[PDB]
């Protein structure tokens, strides 16, 4: 068996010993067995087939990525969402537009938003430094 690592840019998606996998390489659908010669290819969005040693199958969905084979380890550098050239350009256009027009979005941290407002309300008009005669 050989060791398979499926990793995204964000977090790791699998790690364990495998008997075989079947992956949809960009040029053609391919299958990797122990000792496979070093290979390097892109891969298309789609499933990937694993058989965990003792033959136990499973399927994983990928948005694409790159498959890198060495004799004893194979790794699929997956990615989080579909990649292309129209889609990335859509994202680039929206990002320029949000700067050209100074569109400011909020975060979602409701906890900080509550504590910050309770603190701003509490700390107001105390005037204590006029009252405690702290020089400062």
């Amino acid at each position: 068996t050989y060791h398979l690592d499926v990793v995204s840019a964000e977090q790791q998606m699998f790690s364990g010993l495998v008997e075989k996998i079947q992956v949809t390489g960009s040029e053609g659908e391919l299958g990797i067995y122990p000792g496979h010669a070093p290979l390097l290819t892109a891969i298309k969005p789609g499933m990937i087939r694993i058989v965990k040693q003792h033959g136990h199958e499973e399927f994983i969905y990928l948005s694409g990525g790159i498959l890198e084979v060495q004799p004893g380890n194979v790794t699929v550098l997956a990615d989080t969402a579909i990649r292309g050239q129209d889609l990335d350009e859509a994202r680039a256009m929206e990002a320029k537009r949000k700067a050209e027009e100074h569109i400011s979005s909020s975060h979602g941290d409701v906890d900080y938003a509550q504590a910050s407002a309770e603190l701003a309300k509490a700390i107001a008009q105390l005037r204590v430094i006029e009252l405690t005669k702290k020089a400062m």
Binding site: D111, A115, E118
Partner: protein
């Protein structure tokens, strides 16, 4: 015996004092306001068998008598540091503090743990209640502070989550 307001007694003593022109003290209460309540609540006593036998001249011999007292005090804005409220906290054996922020929230009776205590404690508590209720008070106090921290802090650990929801069941 349950004195409905030992506060409205202090006020009437003040009135009838300043009308005899006796010199006042803090809060304009007469000088000896403390000696007013002290000589009242100190009659709430448990008295042993020899005292009862020697008082009733041998008509009762095995019994011990007693007189519990529950004086009621009114506090402005929950201030327990005022003249009269703090006098009596020094005279009695404990206090039950009834909290308005609880009472207005439908928690009734609004007994505030932590700040309320009984200085005779479990010696006065029946064995079964002493056994079951041993931990309730500090559990509620710590739940009541944790439930304040939780106001800001979403995504709590599931140890503190199991503490909070349990304290909430019991409350």
């Amino acid at each position: 015996i349950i004195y409905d307001d030992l506060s409205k007694q202090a006020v009437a003593y003040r009135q009838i004092s300043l009308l005899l022109r006796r010199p006042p003290g803090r809060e304009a209460f007469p000088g000896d306001v403390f000696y007013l309540h002290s000589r009242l609540l100190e009659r709430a006593a448990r008295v042993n068998a020899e005292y009862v036998e020697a008082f009733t001249k041998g008509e009762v011999k095995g019994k011990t008598g007693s007189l519990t007292a529950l004086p009621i005090i009114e506090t402005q804005a929950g201030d327990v540091s005022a003249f009269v409220p703090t006098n009596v906290i020094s005279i009695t054996d404990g206090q039950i503090f009834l909290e308005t922020n609880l009472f207005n929230a439908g928690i009734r009776p609004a007994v505030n743990p932590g700040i309320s205590v009984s200085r005779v404690g479990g010696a006065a508590q029946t064995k079964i209640m002493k056994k079951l209720s041993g931990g309730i008070r500090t559990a509620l106090a710590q739940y009541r502070e944790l439930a304040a921290f939780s106001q800001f802090a979403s995504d709590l650990d599931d140890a503190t989550r199991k503490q909070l929801d349990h304290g909430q069941k019991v409350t």
